[PDB]
Design a binder for this molecule. Structure first.
Ligand SMILES: Nc1ncnc2c1ncn2[C@@H]1O[C@H](COP(=O)(O)OP(=O)(O)OP(O)(O)=S)[C@@H](O)[C@H]1O
Ligand SMILES: [Mg+2]
Lengths: 71, 436
């Protein structure tokens, strides 16, 4: 739940199909509270917002490491 | 099930208009031209809907009633819900208690409907303007109920940062090789302290076998051994030959390899997770059509039905590509809309937007002088149909055609004495009010 929304770290793909579930993914339309599609929009947004923020952090690391070797 | 309404200092409503009941269904309003009728509904969505949200100074001032200044600071509005405003972000006095904007943001959706119903109102002579409205605009109309393009904005926007991010990914990617490299160096530099400790034992045992092997014989001179002789140099010759001393090579390589592994699992993860977001999208970009081309059905399927009420003389269908209205007013000969009478068009308008309004039916609806240009025939057909629609929802209309009246529920007039405008409630003599 909740984990999703505001949009620190969590797992991407593990959610990209938690959404597909709110759509039709393994082909059982349609349950839950579905996709306000407003919701879908602002979520997707968030996912990427983080997916990005991850790759950044990653890079920050590699570098902070790589230079720490130069020592 | 609206509750009460009264104002203080809002637009032409100067001081107090404690001049309102009233209950569900077909409440109708009128009065003179620019008495404040439309201002009044402004009053309404003013509170109900976030059409009055951010915009600053000359916008925010306007609202407060600028009648030779006066108490420019005091502009209050009562529905049951109070929203006062003064000069500079003097916000909601929210329902006697007192809450926030973000608060009933949630509450209207859990009502509702919300901000979210865009056909919750309907002026403007727009209805009009929509005669004017051409094929593509129709699409829009539809989308904007299923919210669709408010969605589409996001999509594209994410999809940018998405493929924007993915250049960090490459900048990243570079750095890893550059790491892989720094461990390719830290590899040889352990190979050695390996091969090295290899020797200074390998050597240091020859050293100890021959300390024996050849003192063994001096043990006995008292009444592979050559192979080892020069082999013990072929060792010493190298520890002294090749040693950039470092006692840490297998410590410093243990950790700094672990991380490279830890990282290149993260690094790897990304790709995997990209290919899944990137996959998510198409799962949704499909769903959007599913959401639309579904509403479309519901809308058409309402439309005819609705139309065929208003004009049971002929039929109307919707075609789609990117949207059209096929039409005949009496079964005789049909076709496209961009051929019809001013008024002739104007019918559809309504129908349509009812057709639409009523597919996500909200608790409430208003209609600025929706009847301002259609003439006779229809007016009857409309007011009745609307009233029929009244049952289940709260309705509020302005009019100046009386034809909604010979049919109406409640009844209100607005009066303008030069600085104040007032609503007053009358009935039959109200209906007499116009006819004058
Ligand atoms: N906040 C305000 N303070 C003072 N005067 C205002 C304010 N808002 C509007 N007015 C005046 O009131 C008029 C607007 O009244 P409306 O509600 O548009 O009349 P109306 O109900 O639309 O009547 P019609 O049929 O649309 S002419 C404007 O022309 C302004 O002169
Ligand atoms: Mg008007």
């Amino acid at each position: 739940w909740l984990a999703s929304n505001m949009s620190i770290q969590t797992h991407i793909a593990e959610s990209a199909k938690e959404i597909a579930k709110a759509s039709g993914c393994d082909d059982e339309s349609g349950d839950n509270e579905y996709i306000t599609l407003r919701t879908s929009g602002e979520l997707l947004q968030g996912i990427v917002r983080v997916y990005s923020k991850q790759a950044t952090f990653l890079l920050t690391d590699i570098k902070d490491t790589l230079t720490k070797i130069s020592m | 099930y609206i509750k009460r309404v009264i104002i203080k200092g809002f637009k032409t409503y100067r001081n107090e208009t404690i001049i309102d009941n009233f209950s569900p269904h077909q409440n109708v309003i009128i009065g003179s031209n620019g008495s404040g009728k439309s201002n009044f509904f402004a009053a309404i969505r003013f509170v109900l809907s976030d059409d009055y949200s951010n915009l600053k100074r000359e916008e925010r001032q306007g609202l407060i009633h600028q009648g030779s200044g006066g108490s420019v600071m005091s502009a209050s509005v009562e529905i049951v819900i109070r929203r006062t405003v003064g000069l500079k972000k003097d916000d909601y006095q929210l329902n006697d208690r007192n809450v926030t904007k973000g608060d009933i943001v949630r509450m209207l959706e859990t009502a509702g409907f919300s901000m979210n119903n865009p056909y919750n109102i309907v002026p403007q002579g727009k209805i009009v303007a929509l005669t004017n409205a051409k094929d593509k605009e129709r699409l829009q109309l539809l989308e904007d109920v299923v919210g669709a393009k408010s969605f589409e904005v996001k999509l594209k926007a994410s999809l940018k940062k998405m493929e924007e991010t993915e250049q960090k990914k490459i900048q990243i990617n570079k750095e890893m090789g550059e790491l892989n490299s720094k461990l390719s160096e830290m590899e040889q530099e352990r190979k050695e302290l390996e091969k090295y400790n290899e020797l200074e034992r390998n050597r240091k045992i020859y050293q100890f076998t021959l300390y024996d092997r050849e003192l063994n014989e001096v043990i006995n001179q008292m009444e592979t051994s050559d192979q080892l002789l020069q082999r013990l140099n072929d060792m010493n010759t190298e520890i002294s030959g090749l040693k950039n001393v470092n006692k840490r090579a297998f410590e410093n390589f243990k950790k700094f390899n672990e991380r490279r592994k830890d990282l290149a699992e993260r690094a790897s993860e990304l790709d995997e997770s990209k290919d899944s977001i990137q996959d998510l999208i198409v799962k949704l970009k499909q769903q959007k059509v599913n959401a639309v081309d579904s509403t479309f059905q519901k809308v058409s399927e309402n439309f005819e039905a609705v139309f065929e009420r208003l004009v049971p003389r002929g039929t109307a269908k919707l075609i789609i590509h990117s949207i059209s209205v096929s039409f005949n007013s009496k079964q005789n000969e049909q076709l496209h809309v961009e051929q019809l009478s001013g008024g002739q068009k104007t019918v559809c308008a309504i129908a349509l937007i009812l057709a639409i309004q009523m597919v996500d039916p909200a608790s409430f609806y208003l209609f600025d002088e929706i009847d301002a240009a259609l003439d006779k025939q229809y007016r009857t057909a409309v007011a009745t149909l609307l009233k029929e629609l009244s049952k289940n929802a709260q309705f509020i209309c302005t009019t100046f055609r009386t034809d909604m009246l010979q049919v109406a529920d409640k009844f209100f007039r607005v009066k303008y004495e030069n600085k104040i405008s007032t609503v007053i409630e009358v009935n039959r003599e109200e209906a007499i009010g116009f006819i004058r």
